[PDB]
């Protein structure tokens, strides 16, 4: 029922997760710039390359992350990049965060060179995850769990990560049985979405190919993290 070691872990996490890292002058472009396929794409590239920085600075703050093998630290970042980004945007659409300009962010994604084959699943995903009516603690706990996934390919010590992940799952499960006793299946549902999240890694690899064969520019930072040759 939320011990000390936990009421403290959660607070350190809600602390990081809550730092307003993305600059207002930057996210404001989602609202003020012209709406065209090219501009929508450039702005989305700028949000994503800025978000990569917020993630790393959030990940660094995750308990015991900095004690992991430097090679694994990369594998984890490269592995969860896409998923963590879907989680953040999902929160923008689901909980209508002001800094996200939800409806205008959606206009730009729906017209940035992405095939209907991916737009449909993508938004279908956002709708059902919103129906879980999650809290900021769940979103944050969820992201930290995704980043610390011992599953990611190329990990050298898949047990030192599980060990760093376990505490987080525990606090999430607890927080579920606590304010959601109504139904003891909520923890399971959240974890279910994790599986659905994974699905977009493939989709994202195809989206990048399409953008690339169409002469689209990313950033040195995005290219490194997504392995864009």
């Amino acid at each position: 029922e939320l011990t000390p070691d936990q009421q403290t872990l959660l607070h350190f996490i809600m602390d990081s997760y809550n730092k307003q890292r993305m600059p207002q002058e930057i996210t404001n472009k989602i609202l003020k710039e012209e709406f065209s396929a090219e501009e929508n794409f450039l702005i989305l590239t700028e949000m994503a390359t800025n978000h990569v920085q917020v993630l790393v600075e959030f990940t660094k703050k995750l308990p015991g992350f900095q004690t992991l093998d430097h090679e694994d630290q990369i594998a984890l970042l490269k592995g969860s990049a896409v998923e963590a980004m879907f989680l953040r945007s999902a929160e923008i659409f689901n909980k209508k965060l002001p800094s996200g300009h939800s409806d205008l962010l959606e206009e730009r994604i729906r017209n940035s060179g992405i095939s209907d084959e991916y737009i449909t699943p993508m938004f279908s995903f956002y709708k059902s995850i919103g129906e879980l009516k999650m809290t900021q603690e769940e979103y944050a706990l969820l992201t930290a769990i995704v980043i610390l996934s011992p599953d990611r390919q190329y990990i050298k010590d898949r047990e030192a990560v599980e060990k760093l992940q376990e505490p987080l799952l525990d606090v999430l499960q607890k927080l579920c049985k606590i304010h959601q006793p109504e139904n003891p299946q909520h923890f399971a549902c959240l974890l279910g979405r994790l599986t659905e999240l994974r699905t977009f890694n493939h989709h994202h690899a195809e989206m990048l190919m399409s953008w690339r064969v169409n002469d689209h520019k990313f950033t040195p930072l995005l290219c490194e993290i997504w392995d864009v040759q």
């Binding site: 790393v56 900095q66 970042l77 490269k78 040195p220 930072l221 490194e224 993290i225």
Partner: peptide, 11 residues
Amino acid sequence: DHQLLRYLLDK
């Protein structure tokens, strides 16, 4: 390789 990510971590 991955000098950008490494650079962000060491920052």
